[PDB]
Design a protein around this motif. Structure first.
Motif, PDB file in Angstrom:
ATOM      1  N   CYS A   1       0.821  -1.197   0.000  1.00  0.00           N
ATOM      2  CA  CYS A   1       0.000   0.000   0.000  1.00  0.00           C
ATOM      3  C   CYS A   1       0.863   1.258   0.000  1.00  0.00           C
ATOM      4  O   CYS A   1       1.689   1.480   0.903  1.00  0.00           O
ATOM      5  CB  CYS A   1      -1.002  -0.007   1.146  1.00  0.00           C
TER       6      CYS A   1
ATOM      7  N   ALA B   1      -0.130   4.327   0.368  1.00  0.00           N
ATOM      8  CA  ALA B   1      -0.546   5.356   1.316  1.00  0.00           C
ATOM      9  C   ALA B   1       0.514   5.515   2.416  1.00  0.00           C
ATOM     10  O   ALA B   1       1.093   4.525   2.868  1.00  0.00           O
ATOM     11  CB  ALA B   1      -1.886   4.998   1.922  1.00  0.00           C
TER      12      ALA B   1
ATOM     13  N   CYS C   1       1.341   3.176   5.806  1.00  0.00           N
ATOM     14  CA  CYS C   1       0.506   1.982   5.788  1.00  0.00           C
ATOM     15  C   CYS C   1       1.330   0.740   5.612  1.00  0.00           C
ATOM     16  O   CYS C   1       2.201   0.694   4.738  1.00  0.00           O
ATOM     17  CB  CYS C   1      -0.586   2.076   4.735  1.00  0.00           C
TER      18      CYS C   1
ATOM     19  N   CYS D   1      -4.511  -0.462  -0.063  1.00  0.00           N
ATOM     20  CA  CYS D   1      -5.342  -1.453   0.628  1.00  0.00           C
ATOM     21  C   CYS D   1      -6.863  -1.056   0.550  1.00  0.00           C
ATOM     22  O   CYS D   1      -7.206  -0.059  -0.103  1.00  0.00           O
ATOM     23  CB  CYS D   1      -4.869  -1.617   2.073  1.00  0.00           C
TER      24      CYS D   1
ATOM     25  N   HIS E   1      -7.390   2.576   2.008  1.00  0.00           N
ATOM     26  CA  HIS E   1      -6.772   3.718   1.348  1.00  0.00           C
ATOM     27  C   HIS E   1      -7.045   3.831  -0.138  1.00  0.00           C
ATOM     28  O   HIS E   1      -6.585   4.791  -0.753  1.00  0.00           O
ATOM     29  CB  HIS E   1      -5.251   3.707   1.572  1.00  0.00           C
TER      30      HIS E   1
END
Ligand SMILES: [Zn+2]
Ligand SMILES: [Zn+2]
Ligand SMILES: [Zn+2]
Length: 572
Positions: free
Chosen positions: A50, A52, A55, A72, A75
């Motif tokens: 992920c 983000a 994360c 994920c 996100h």
């Protein structure tokens, strides 16, 4: 970072990040893998994680493609596609057996069965994964620091606390600190340094953990059958000595590869060297895993082949003393004798790979990658000992699972079989012929009436796990007083600790069954030491009793093997 799938060759940008060898897996096979195993990390140019900030979602089944990036379920943007859907993992260019090879710890026999019954590409994945696992396991052991130097052959060791101690035998070679390789045998310990050095007090030793290279070549090239002898030119004047193998030498030139099962003393090195006399202009590379096997081939070549056309290849890391009668490291000589690990990248008319039961699929693949030959000949015997599998603790590994060549010899039979043992007294030949050869091995010698068996369980003690049976050695000592011709016997047992005790009490030269393979002696004294799966193994038992040319004394623990020995029983 882009390559071919180990299961269906389909191109992909996907590699399994949880597999120790990080194999390339296509969209369909990568899916079948992640959705059936604990392996959820998939690698591309950038890993499937992920994007983000902060994360930690790395599981491919919990990730999506948000435009050109991965996120994920927490996100992802509104317009995002799951990475795992419709039986595929998203990548570029858009398995039960692969899963088991990828996730096993190699401690079970079933793991090696699978590594040998699978597809060819999976045999290479299995061999690489296993060898890498075997090396990463060497990291998981304790260091030995010199406490005191007693003599030039004996010292005292201090072991690292919290880490296990490796078995002190010839199967475990440590690298000294780079003051040469060293070996140990059992508070006083015996030291055998390959390089003669004044063993510094306090200096440490560590087991050599070599880097496992990837495998490209198959364990066996695809078989080809020919109508005529191909690329080889036979002599019309073949020495009487080698006449028995002429039909077999012809079979060798009429197939890409051939298998020869040669029981003990049936003429394997005679066949191997005779193949050079049969195709006199052929360039032959003679290979085996051990320096001893390669040297035994050199000894046979020294007797029949021109010495100026022979070369023994010895790497700069000169591990142990080997064959000194050929020009060293001349890769271009007509006859090249070299261990598998030291093979140069070269070509040959014939490659002869001896002691094939000791080869692994890793070794089989390396030979195919370093040597490009017109013909490959695999000589050995699946009824003899395989290479030790250091990780294997549960289950017994059968001969059909030693490697691809042994699998073929045990399933479809060998292409050629040397049926007459010329070494052993008939009592020994009749015993092993019934035990492991389906009654096909015949004796050339008569019964020597010097083959004895004694059923004596004795008392089993242990040096850690290696076993000792002092009462069985006492029986040998009693027998030696009454049978002085046996003064020249070699003492053999399945345990080095038993051999260490027999060496001091009897004074006979000593040999484990595993180190006696390929060697022969007039008289052999064998003490079974224990009734374990190890000491009762029929291949080990076969090698043990076939070392004898004239006589053998077997002090047995197991009723079954004792009752099968076609020897004269002794009392006491
Ligand atoms: Zn695939
Ligand atoms: Zn994996
Ligand atoms: Zn996330």
């Amino acid at each position: 970072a882009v390559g071919a799938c180990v299961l269906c060759n389909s191109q992909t940008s996907l590699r399994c990040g949880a597999c120790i060898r990080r194999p390339f897996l296509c969209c369909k096979c990568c899916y079948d893998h992640v959705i059936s195993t604990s392996h959820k990390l998939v690698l591309s140019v950038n890993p499937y994680v992920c994007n983000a900030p902060g994360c930690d979602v790395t599981d491919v089944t919990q990730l999506y493609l948000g435009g050109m990036s991965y996120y994920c379920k927490s996100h992802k943007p509104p317009i995002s596609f799951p990475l795992c859907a419709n039986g595929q993992v998203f990548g570029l260019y858009k398995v039960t057996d692969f899963n088991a090879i990828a996730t096993c710890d190699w401690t079970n026999a079933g793991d090696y069965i699978l590594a040998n019954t699978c597809t060819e590409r999976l045999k290479l994945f299995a061999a690489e994964t296993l060898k890498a696992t075997e090396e990463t396991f060497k990291l998981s052991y304790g260091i030995a620091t010199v406490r005191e130097v007693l003599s030039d052959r004996e010292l005292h060791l201090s072991w690292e606390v919290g880490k296990p101690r490796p078995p002190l035998n010839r199967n475990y070679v440590f690298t000294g600190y780079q003051i040469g390789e060293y070996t140990f045998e059992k508070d006083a310990v015996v030291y055998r340094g390959t390089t003669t050095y004044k063993l510094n007090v306090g200096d440490y030793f560590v087991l050599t953990s070599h880097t496992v290279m990837p495998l490209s070549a198959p364990t066996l090239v695809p078989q080809e059958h020919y109508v005529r002898i191909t690329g080889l030119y036979p002599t019309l004047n073949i020495s009487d000595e080698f006449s028995s193998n002429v039909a077999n030498y012809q079979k060798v030139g009429m197939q890409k590869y051939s298998t020869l099962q040669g029981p003990p003393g049936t003429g394997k090195s005679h066949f191997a060297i005779g193949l050079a006399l049969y195709y006199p202009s052929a360039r032959i590379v003679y290979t085996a895993c051990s320096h001893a096997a390669v040297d035994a081939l050199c000894e046979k070549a020294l007797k029949y082949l021109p010495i100026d056309k022979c070369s023994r290849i010895i790497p700069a890391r000169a591990r142990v003393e080997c064959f000194d009668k050929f020009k060293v490291n001349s890769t271009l000589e007509q006859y090249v004798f070299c261990t598998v690990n030291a093979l140069p990248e070269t070509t040959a008319d014939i490659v002869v790979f001896d002691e094939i039961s000791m080869a692994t699929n890793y070794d089989l693949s390396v030979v195919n990658a370093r040597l490009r030959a017109k013909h490959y000949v695999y000589i050995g015997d699946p009824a003899q000992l395989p290479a030790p599998r250091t990780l294997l603790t549960k289950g017994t590994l059968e001969p059909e699972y030693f490697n691809s060549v042994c699998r073929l010899m045990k399933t479809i039979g060998p292409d050629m079989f040397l049926g007459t043992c010329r070494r052993c007294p008939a009592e020994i030949v009749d015993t092993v012929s019934a035990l492991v050869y389906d009654n096909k091995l015949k004796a050339h010698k008569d019964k020597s009436a010097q083959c004895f068996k004694m059923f004596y369980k004795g008392v089993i003690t242990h040096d850690v796990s290696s076993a000792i049976n002092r009462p069985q050695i006492g029986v040998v000592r009693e027998f030696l007083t009454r049978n002085p011709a046996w003064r020249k016997a070699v003492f053999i047992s399945p345990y080095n600790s038993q051999n260490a005790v027999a060496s001091k009490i009897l004074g006979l030269p000593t040999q484990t069954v595993d180190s006696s393979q390929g060697s022969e002696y007039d008289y052999v004294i064998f003490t079974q030491t224990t009734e374990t799966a190890h000491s009762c193994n029929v291949n080990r038992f076969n090698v043990a009793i076939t070392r004898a040319k004239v006589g053998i004394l077997c002090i047995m623990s197991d009723r079954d093997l004792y009752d099968k020995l076609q020897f004269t029983s002794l009392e006491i």
